[PDB]
Amino acid sequence: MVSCGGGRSVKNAACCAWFPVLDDIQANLFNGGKCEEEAHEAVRLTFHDAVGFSLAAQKAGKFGGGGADGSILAFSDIETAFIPNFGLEFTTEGFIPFALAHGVSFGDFVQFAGAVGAANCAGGPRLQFLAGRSNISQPSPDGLVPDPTDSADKILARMADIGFSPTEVVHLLASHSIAAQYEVDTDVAGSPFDSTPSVFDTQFFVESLLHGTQFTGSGQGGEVMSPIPGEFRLQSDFALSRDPRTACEWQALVNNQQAMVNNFEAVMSRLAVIGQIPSELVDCSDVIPTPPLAKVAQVGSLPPGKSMADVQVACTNGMPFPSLPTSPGPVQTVAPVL
Ligand code: HEM
Ligand SMILES: [Ca+2]
Ligand SMILES: [Ca+2]
Ligand SMILES: [Cl-]
Ligand code: NA
């Protein structure tokens, strides 16, 4: 190892340059190292950046997008006008000055910010962070970002088209354990996808499998019924939790928080280098912070007022759910991330 000063160490000396970026964003973008709206947006941005890539396009002799290349920032004017990217201009205009201030590529900044963001959440992962992506990019083609109204067929096809199996899609969706909607229905902006959007835990997997009982929003734009007031459910998460191709992996995560973390780290390592050549990158993973000391449950809980009878069993070849514990107390509305 070498030292960067002040007791901070890295394997690769060039990585020391990322500590001033760390300090700036933890203080001035993430509100002192929190896992709240900006951290969630940073995680979401890694995917909106990387998903602008198409193996099929490449096979047809067309440009499919340069993947995890910072194009969502370099060409925010273009990409934020894509339908599934609506409203992302608040995020891209917020993020851009940090990349520019520190002289790092947009492509590295997007991956660095999502790694740091996720690492702020209790229970959270420590994503691999490789640096070195060119600052020269081209805009993503339109039509490549999944939409929450898309069927499981269409989403799984789009994801296979950037290199991910349906099992890996479920692993990537561990991100919706730290997540809310702002644009599907602005009337209920901040309504999260699980009861714990600051905790990287298995509650998204448990709660998405419950029967829907009420709408949080107006039921437009891909919202379907969720199982707790204040919690928002996407049609796409409903479809993937219950599709034969994905359901058994979805179920297998409800009682293994650590495997959810490990699997998320594994798939995000791939996501962050889509369109990139890893041998051209430098490993700066040791700049990424450790998550808060916090004991996150390894096994998820049914929310208050729910029993095992409320859980949809969609996995066939695998096998039954364990009696998951039930959280104590009354039914309570999930607070929005505002
Ligand atoms: C598989 C297809 C996916 C669909 C259809 C989908 C859909 C969405 C939608 C509709 C939102 C709310 C956007 C808004 O109105 O504010 C959202 C939020 C979010 N998504 Fe996904 N998503 C997908 C995959 C992913 C992936 C692969 C990741 C990252 C690994 C991700 C990370 C997030 C995060 C962290 C948020 C919360 C952002 C915030 O709270 O500010 N999603 N997703
Ligand atoms: Ca991109
Ligand atoms: Ca959660
Ligand atoms: Cl670098
Ligand atoms: Na790894």
End-to-end CA distance of the chain: 41
Nearest CA to 141 among 72, 75, 65, 77?
Answer: 65
Q: Tell me the CA–centroid distance for residue 84 and ligand 1, in Å.
A: 10
Q: Cβ–Cβ contacts within 10 Å for residue 267, how many?
A: 22
For residues 59 and 7, give the distance between their C-alpha atoms in angstroms, rounded to a whole number. 49
Residue 39 Cβ < 6 Å to ligand 1: no
Nearest CA to 164 among 239, 238, 245?
Answer: 245
Q: Are 143 and 62 in contact (CB under 8 A)?
A: no
Ligand that lies nearest to the alpha carbon of residue 130, given by its number in the listed order:
4
Residue 181 Cβ < 6 Å to ligand 1: yes
Q: Tell me the CA–centroid distance for residue 41 and ligand 2, in Å.
A: 15
Q: Tell me the CA–centroid distance for residue 88 and ligand 3, in Å.
A: 22
For residues 191 and 37, give the distance between their C-alpha atoms in angstroms, rounded to a whole number. 11
Residue ranges of alpha helices (H) inside the chain are 18-28, 37-50, 55-59, 71-74, 76-79, 89-102, 106-119, 152-160, 166-172, 203-208, 235-242, 247-253, 257-271
Of the residues 40, 48, 102, 211, only one is catalytic, namely 48
Q: Are 132 and 281 in contact (CB under 8 A)?
A: yes
Task: Please state the φ and ψ torsions of residue 282, each to the nearest 5 degrees.
Answer: -110, 135
Domains of the chain: 12-145+267-295 (1.10.520.10), 146-266+296-338 (1.10.420.10)
Residue 10 belongs to what H/E stretch? Answer: strand 8-10
145 labelled ligand-binding = no
- Which experimental technique did the depositors report for determining this structure? X-ray
- 48 is known as an active-site residue: yes
Helix-strand-coil split of the chain, %, nearest 5: 40, 10, 50
Residue 180 Cβ < 6 Å to ligand 1: yes
Longest dimension (CA), the chain: 59
Per-residue CA distances from 313 to 241, 252, 264 (Å): 10, 12, 23
For residues 326 and 338, give the distance between their C-alpha atoms in angstroms, rounded to a whole number. 27
For residues 303 and 319, give the distance between their C-alpha atoms in angstroms, rounded to a whole number. 22
Taking a 5 Å cut-off on Cβ, the residues next to ion ligand 5 are: 269
Q: Tell me the CA–centroid distance for residue 4 and ligand 4, in Å.
A: 14
Mention every residue, 6+ apart, whose C-beta is less than 8 A from residue 206.
254, 300, 301, 302, 303, 311, 324
> Given ligand 1 and candidates 30, 145, 176, 199, which is best to mutate, with the most ligand atoms within 8 Å of its CB?
176
For residues 257 and 313, give the distance between their C-alpha atoms in angstroms, rounded to a whole number. 19
Residue 227 Cβ < 6 Å to ligand 1: no
Nearest CA to 150 among 50, 248, 234?
Answer: 234
